[PDB]
Paper text:
Modified cyclohexane rings, such as sulfide 6 and difluorocyclohexane 7, resulted in further increases in potency. The binding modes of compound 7 (ERAP1 pIC50 = 7.7) and compound 13 (ERAP1 pIC50 = 8.6) largely overlaid well. As predicted for the FEP pose for compound 10, the most significant difference was in the orientation of the bicyclic ring, which presented the bromine atom and phenyl ring of compounds 7 and 13, respectively, into the lipophilic pocket. To examine this selectivity, we tested compound 7, which was one of the most potent compounds in both the biochemical and cellular assays at the time. Pleasingly, 7 showed no measurable inhibition of ERAP2 or IRAP (pIC50 < 4.0, n = 1) and thus had >1,000-fold ERAP1 selectivity. In contrast, compound 7 had a significantly reduced unbound in vivo clearance with both good oral exposure and bioavailability. Furthermore, compound 7 demonstrated a much lower in vitro intrinsic clearance in rat and human hepatocytes, is 10-fold less lipophilic than compound 13, and has a much higher FaSSIF solubility. Furthermore, compound 7 had promising pharmacokinetic properties in rats, providing an excellent starting point for further optimization, which will be the subject of future publications.
Endoplasmic reticulum aminopeptidase 1 (ERAP1) cleaves the N-terminal amino acids of peptides, which can then bind onto major histocompatibility class I (MHC-I) molecules for presentation onto the cell surface, driving the activation of adaptive immune responses. Herein we describe the hit-to-lead optimization of a series of cyclohexyl acid ERAP1 inhibitors, found by X-ray crystallography to bind at an allosteric regulatory site.
Residue numbers in the entry: 45 to 485, 515 to 552, 559 to 936
Write the structure that this text describes.
Amino acid sequence: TPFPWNKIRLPEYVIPVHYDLLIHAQLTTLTFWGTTKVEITASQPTSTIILHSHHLQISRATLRKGAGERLSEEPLQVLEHPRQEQIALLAPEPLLVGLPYTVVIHYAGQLSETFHGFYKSTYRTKEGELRILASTQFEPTAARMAFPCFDEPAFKASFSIKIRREPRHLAISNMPLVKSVTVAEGLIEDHFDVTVKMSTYLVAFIISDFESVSKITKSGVKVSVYAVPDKINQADYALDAAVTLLEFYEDYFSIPYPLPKQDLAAIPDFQSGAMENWGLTTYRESALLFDAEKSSASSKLGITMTVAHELAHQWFGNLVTMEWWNDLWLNEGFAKFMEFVSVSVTHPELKVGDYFFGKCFDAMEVDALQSSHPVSTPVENPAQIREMFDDVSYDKGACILNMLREYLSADAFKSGIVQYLQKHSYKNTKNEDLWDSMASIVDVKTMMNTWTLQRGFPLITITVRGRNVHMKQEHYMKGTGYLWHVPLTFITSKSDMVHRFLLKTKTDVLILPEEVEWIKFNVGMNGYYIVHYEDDGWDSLTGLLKGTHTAVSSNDRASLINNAFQLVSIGKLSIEKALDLSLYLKHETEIMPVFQGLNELIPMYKLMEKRDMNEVETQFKAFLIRLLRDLIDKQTWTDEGSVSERMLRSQLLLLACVHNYQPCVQRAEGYFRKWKESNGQLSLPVDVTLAVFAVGAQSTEGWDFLYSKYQFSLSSTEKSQIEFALCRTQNKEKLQWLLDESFKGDKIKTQEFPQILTLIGRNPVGYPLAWQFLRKNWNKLVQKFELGSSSIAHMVMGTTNQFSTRTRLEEVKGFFSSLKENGSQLRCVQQTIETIEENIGWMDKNFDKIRVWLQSE
Ligand SMILES: O=C(CN1C(=O)COc2ccc(Br)cc21)NC1(C(=O)O)CCC(F)(F)CC1
Ligand SMILES: O=C(CN1C(=O)COc2ccc(Br)cc21)NC1(C(=O)O)CCC(F)(F)CC1
Ligand SMILES: [Zn+2]
């Protein structure tokens, strides 16, 4: 019997209203069974119900009509289309239009051994015992692996969840537990309250032995953090941050959080950083748990931002959801942007607003390639949908919202988002709904369509002739018509007021009131565009940075460093002039411009490390250390100062030690010797630990001692610092061991494998082993992480994007084209090919220039 539906999307005429999900998971055999009851209505006569199901064995399906006295049941015939992840249920007579029916499906499955669906997670107690738990991760299309459903985000429905479990386990889900009932064969059935109307991807449930801590918000919401018993003592920071952030968002949006409780659970095995399931947000332990003695300043910032992101989603994603995955940025760009809006207010000590522009420069790297896609773009299958979870949806999405907020003003933008959330509460939206809301408070639709429907971003060229300022825009591309409505901003030598000019055409002109010594566009890097200055423009800004660098903000200095190097890539500025500009960094003190200098200069030597260029590579590395030597020398070996001072310290000390700067290497060797002689008991300053461990792991004894401490650590920062240090070994047998062991998941968890593969891919001696490992183990890696996932995209780019020869380009093209349906069409593959093509052209043009410049410098 042919399958009666030929489309990836489900029919639009059968709609669910409510699901009753009963799940029994047997953690001793990894089998689960369920009964799903879904109340539906049909708007056109049909005898066939199509819905999603993947890897579930259906034992029986029946169609009910009526209740009690008038109940009628009809058996349904079940058909399956595994490639479309669908099942068809066939009734013996047509459904009556507009009348309620209940589909009842009994099925079984096996707990997934991936990080998606209803999956197995494990950990070892500090006493050595292996513990098994089961958790869910459904976004985007994995709810269908746990229960048959209409698994598209616009089919919203309420869910009543019941979990049968052993008495030794605890079950939690989206809503509060209302009753526990003893049932047959020594089990307990927990009943959770009904959810509000929501998408299938947000259903969650966890069966575990977690401990918890709680705190109540001013609005009466019970917030709890859940974690393994040996780590609940690290939950207080996130619990306090979650309460403060939930209160912030309730007040900011003028829309209360609608559920009685909000849980934050730290899962021992988790693929992404975290997930926003309504009422039960989930996290990697590293993204939630803070150890006041061992956690880094960057991890404290990361936890605060991750909790802020997941809580923003309770409104931007859960309450209002995109209609389809083509508009995922409506959830992700907004959640990413709201991390900055909220934490800027709640945790002013972190100064996060200072770091926002760095995410925009991240998105520009990828968005400058021909393989970039517009923010809103069509997707159909699960691998294509997973690809939407990328720097374009998150970082470009947040950056264009920041640009729009600065353009409209914060209060008008806030009014627009409140109207949007109120109007579309418990419903789904598309781009046009957001523009209509923003305009209900001036032009938003035409402008924002240029930023969401075209890939890339413009280069703005400025030409100054006395008072006359000529502006032009063109599409910036590495390696056609494009036009944007660009909300330009500028300051000058005579005015530090941020002046505004909306450029909606290819060119325009403005007249300054009086002549100026310099002009600087894109103030604070709040716009998603780059700027080139004709004539003496770059010499003037180079002179400004060299003589009076504090004449512009720290973020404006970072923007000039980034844009000068981006202009070398397209031939608008010579590499010598960009390197001459970078010389001002000898007197720079602020984290953002220092880090931006590293971001531009470090990749040049990473390319050289994989080429026959030792002489220039050594000279370039020596030039970098000479440039930052005074700042390196001023660093104290302590945890003193602000979060920015701590992050700057840690990065500089690590960089100096990696480059064999003897004053730092000798200090690190002394701390490692003392720490090792104390049997790893010694509390080292967290901010010097990366440098100390990286130096210590360069001997066989130090590497072995460091790895021996890894199994006992309960600190996510300490385990990350150890992983980084072990991956810097130049012993190829130890590097292959790290890959084999993290891939296996026993001594080092598989959730760390993408990071270890990238670190080994960046190791100056081990880099061929990472690309080799990826090729050899491709099928198993895709099975574990999924085609289209950000984890697979990070492994592809991490192992290949620093290649710069035609032989390496053909390895990449040849390997991925050979995969056919199992990866040849991945967007990350096209991105790494275009990146390697750019690296080939850039090194051919600039290598000799850099060699000559270094000999003169
Ligand atoms: O180079 C890298 C990793 N990395 C890239 O691969 C590509 O571009 C980058 C830009 C900025 C920064 Br910070 C790091 C990178 N890390 C180090 C290295 O030389 O491999 C150098 C820095 C260290 F010293 F802090 C760690 C090691
Ligand atoms: O390398 C990374 C980031 N990173 C990965 O990319 C892959 O997985 C990891 C595992 C452990 C640690 Br610690 C870092 C990473 N960061 C730095 C760098 O880019 O070289 C710059 C910041 C730094 F100084 F804190 C560590 C090194
Ligand atoms: Zn998100």
